Amino acid sequence: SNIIDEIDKASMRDDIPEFRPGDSVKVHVKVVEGSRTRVQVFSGIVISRTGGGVQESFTVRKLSFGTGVERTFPLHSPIIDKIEVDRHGAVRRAKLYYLRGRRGKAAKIKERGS
């Protein structure tokens, strides 16, 4: 019902930038270190956006030290300080799962308006 949605509006945020899978994104994830806290930047390619209200989440793929790391973030999670969009990709798919098995020049995304 819309009662569920109006309850969700209390948890949803407003400062989310507009982006699509295929875009290069830096997510400023807050990391708890005992007494300390820090902001660690996860830079990568958005490969999926599973939508729907406060349930919206997006997946970012990074290539670090010869291994791929995928992180899935709820788009309205309070652990995300902010989201930066670097490149706007030019893809043809909603889910970029094919990038999992691609590395090198075959794994790079065209920029929007090219």
Partner RNA sequence: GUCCGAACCCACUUCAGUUGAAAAUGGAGGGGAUGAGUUGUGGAUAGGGGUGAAAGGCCAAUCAAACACCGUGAUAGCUGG
Partner RNA sequence: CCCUAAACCGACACUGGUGGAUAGGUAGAGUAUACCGAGGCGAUCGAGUGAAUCGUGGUGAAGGAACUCGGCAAAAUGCCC
Partner RNA sequence: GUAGCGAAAUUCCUUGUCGGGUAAGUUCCGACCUGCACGAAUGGAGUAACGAUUUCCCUACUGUCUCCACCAUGAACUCGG
Partner RNA sequence: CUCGAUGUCGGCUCGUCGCAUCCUGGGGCUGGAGUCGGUCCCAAGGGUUGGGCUGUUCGCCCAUUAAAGCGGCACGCGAGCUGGGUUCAGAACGUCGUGAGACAGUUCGGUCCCUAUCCGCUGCGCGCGGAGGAAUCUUGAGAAGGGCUGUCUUUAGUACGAGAGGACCGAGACGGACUGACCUCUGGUGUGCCAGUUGUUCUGCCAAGAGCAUGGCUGGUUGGCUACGUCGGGUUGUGAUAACCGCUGAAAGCAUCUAAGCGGGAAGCACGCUUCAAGAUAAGGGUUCCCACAGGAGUGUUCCUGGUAAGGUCCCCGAGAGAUGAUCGGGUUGAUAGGCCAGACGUGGACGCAUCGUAAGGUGUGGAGCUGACUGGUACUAAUAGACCGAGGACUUUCA
Which residues here bind other proteins, judged by CB under 8 A? 1, 3-4, 7-8, 11, 29, 31, 33, 42, 53-55, 62, 64-74, 77-79, 100
Q: Is the CB of residue 87 less than 8 Å from the CB of residue 78? A: no
Residue 51 binds Mg ion (CB under 5 A): yes
Q: Residues of 10-43 as b/e, b for ≥16 C-beta within 10 angstroms?
A: eeeeeeeeebebbbbbebebeeeeeeeeeeeebe
Binders of RNA among 23-62, rule CB under 7 A? 48-53, 55-57
Residue 2 binds RNA (CB under 7 A): yes
Task: Choose one: 24-32, 44-52, 66-74, 85-93; the region binding Mg ion (CB under 5 A).
Answer: 44-52
